[PDB]
Amino acid sequence: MVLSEGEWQLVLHVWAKVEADVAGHGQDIFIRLFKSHPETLEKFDRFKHLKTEAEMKASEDLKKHGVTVLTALGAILKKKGHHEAELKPLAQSHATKHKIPIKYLEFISEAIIHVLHSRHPGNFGADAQGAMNKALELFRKDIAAKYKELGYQG
């Protein structure tokens, strides 16, 4: 699949807002993910002990992790589709070291959309959300293709 320049512009416009506070967006996204799909928390040995949202918000390590994840996702989005190089190491670590099913990538994509919708309604209308969903589906499609090449079905 391919996004038009117009769709990329909608994606990058709202992402520019996210970049005004990466750490804050990272926390909301992971808390949303862990609360909506608790099973995903079991994949993080470093955070699986967190019991409440209060504990999650207070975790310095979780906040730092969120910045690392969003920064990588941002680098990929800014390539506007030409992200083959950025995807390689990401796909290998998540398929071989962390063992993350495509299903879980769908869950975090939902968390991202939810948080952007909550925080940036003025820059995340129907068209912009459609553009973001398309960019995330492209991301998941390409990561899935790499998973297969690497020998991981998940």
Name the site residues for ligand HEM (rule: CB under 6 A): 40, 43-44, 46, 65, 68-69, 72-73, 90, 93-94, 98, 100, 104-105, 108
Separation of alpha carbons 113 and 107, rounded Å: 10
Residue 9 or 68 having the CB closest to ligand HEM? 68
- Please report, for residues 11, 26, 80, the alpha-carbon distance to residue 8 in angstroms, rounded to integers and kept in the order given: 5, 21, 7
Q: Which of 140, 55, 58 is nearest to 100 (CA)?
A: 140
Residue facing ligand HEM at closest CB distance: 93
Distance of CA 43 to the CA centre of its chain: 15
Give whichever of 8 and 139 is closer to ligand HEM, judged by the CB atom: 139
Instruction: Name the residue nearer to ligand HEM (CB basis): 6 or 150.
Output: 150
The CA distance from 104 to 33, in Å, is 9
User: Residues marked as binding for nitrite?
Assistant: 65
Closest CB 89 distance from ligand HEM, rounded Å: 6
Least CB distance to ligand HEM at residue 97 (A): 7
CB nearer ligand HEM, residue 69 or residue 122: 69
Binding residues for O2: 65
C-alpha to C-alpha distance for 141 and 154, rounded to whole angstroms: 13
